[PDB]
Amino acid sequence: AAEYAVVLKTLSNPFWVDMKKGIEDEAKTLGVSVDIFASPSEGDFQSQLQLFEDLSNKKYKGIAFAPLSSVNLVMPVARAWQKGLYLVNLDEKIDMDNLKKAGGNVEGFVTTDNVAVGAKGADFIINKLGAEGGEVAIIEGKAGNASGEARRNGATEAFKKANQIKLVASQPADWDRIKALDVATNVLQRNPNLKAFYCANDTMAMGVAQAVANAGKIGKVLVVGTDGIPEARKMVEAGQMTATVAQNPADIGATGLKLMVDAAKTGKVIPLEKTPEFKLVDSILVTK
Numbered sequence: 562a563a564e565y566a567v568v569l570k571t572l573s574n575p576f577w578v579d580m581k582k583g584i585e586d587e588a589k590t591l592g593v594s595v596d597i598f599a600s601p602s603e604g605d606f607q608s609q610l611q612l613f614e615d616l617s618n619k620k621y622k623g624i625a626f627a628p629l630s631s632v633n634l635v636m637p638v639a640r641a642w643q644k645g646l647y648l649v650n651l652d653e654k655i656d657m658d659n660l661k662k663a664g665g666n667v668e669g670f671v672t673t674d675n676v677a678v679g680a681k682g683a684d685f686i687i688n689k690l691g692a693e694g695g696e697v698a699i700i701e702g703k704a705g706n707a708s709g710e711a712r713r714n715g716a717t718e719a720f721k722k723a724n725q726i727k728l729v730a731s732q733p734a735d736w737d738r739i740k741a742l743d744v745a746t747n748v749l750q751r752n753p754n755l756k757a758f759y760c761a762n763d764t765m766a767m768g769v770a771q772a773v774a775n776a777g778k779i780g781k782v783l784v785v786g787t788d789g790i791p792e793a794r795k796m797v798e799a800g801q802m803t804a805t806v807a808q809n810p811a812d813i814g815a816t817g818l819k820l821m822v823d824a825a826k827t828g829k830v831i832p833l834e835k836t837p838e839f840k841l842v843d844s845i846l847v848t849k
């Protein structure tokens with residue numbers, strides 16, 4: 562067992578594959594050993610809990626983690642903090658109110674500005690639709706996930722400021738390709754004048770693009786994703802997706818590791834009452 566553990570969401574999604582490789586590179590750069598785990602699937606709240614708990618029970622100095630939901634890892638993260646492990650939250654913000662109640666904290670949180678991500682996606686759709694504007698929809702991540710909610714809120718508030726836009730639907734598809742395809746299919750059927758989807762990640766954006774194609778509407782309905790996974794960047798380049806707000810999961814991972822290693826060197830965990838370190842990794846809009 563290595564010095565440090567990492568718990569990621571699922572390597573079924575290239576975003577997490579790239580974060581894993583970023584962390585592995587940074588561990589070599591820093592000269593520290595890392596064990597990296599992930600759940601089979603997005604659905605696996607309980608397994609991810611048991612996985613975290615199994616790690617906390619061994620001899621790791623620190624754990625960096627991206628929880629599947631805001632709440633599923635609260636109790637095991639508290640347990641690790643109590644035991645004196647250096648904890649870093651990656652990407653997906655844990656519920657800090659529930660974590661405090663459980664008697665835990667984290668050294669730091671490393672993420673994208675997910676409000677600005679939503680805003681960039683919406684601002685690009687507003688720019689593309691021009692003065693005519695029209696009806697738009699948001700395809701959300703899992704309800705209550707800080708990542709998704711922030712992108713929903715940034716996009717919504719951007720759309721609201723533009724008179725010529727009407728947000729007709731804003732619905733969860735739980736980071737799932739087929740659920741995103743079903744939701745978008747139904748949004749299209751109910752809203753024959755839809756002009757655009759903003760999608761809180763690329764897994765969902767690719768299902769949305771498939772819904773648009775199925776309805777005969779490629780190019781006529783814009784599709785904007787988030788993450789910049791390889792298949793979405795290809796869809797963008799080929800005009801099957803309009804754009805994606807790329808993230809840098811390698812840098813989120815590498816920055817989170819270094820924050821964990823820097824914290825462990827102080828030889829005391831953050832006090833319950835202290836505000837964690839906060840580091841932002843840039844986003845970039847990818848277009849044709």
Ligand SMILES: OC[C@H]1O[C@@H](O)[C@H](O)[C@H](O)[C@@H]1O
Pocket residue numbers: 570574576652653708709736761762763764787788808
């Ligand atoms: O795992 C689903 C999604 O989780 C979010 O928190 C990440 O920032 C990525 O958008 C990822 O695709």
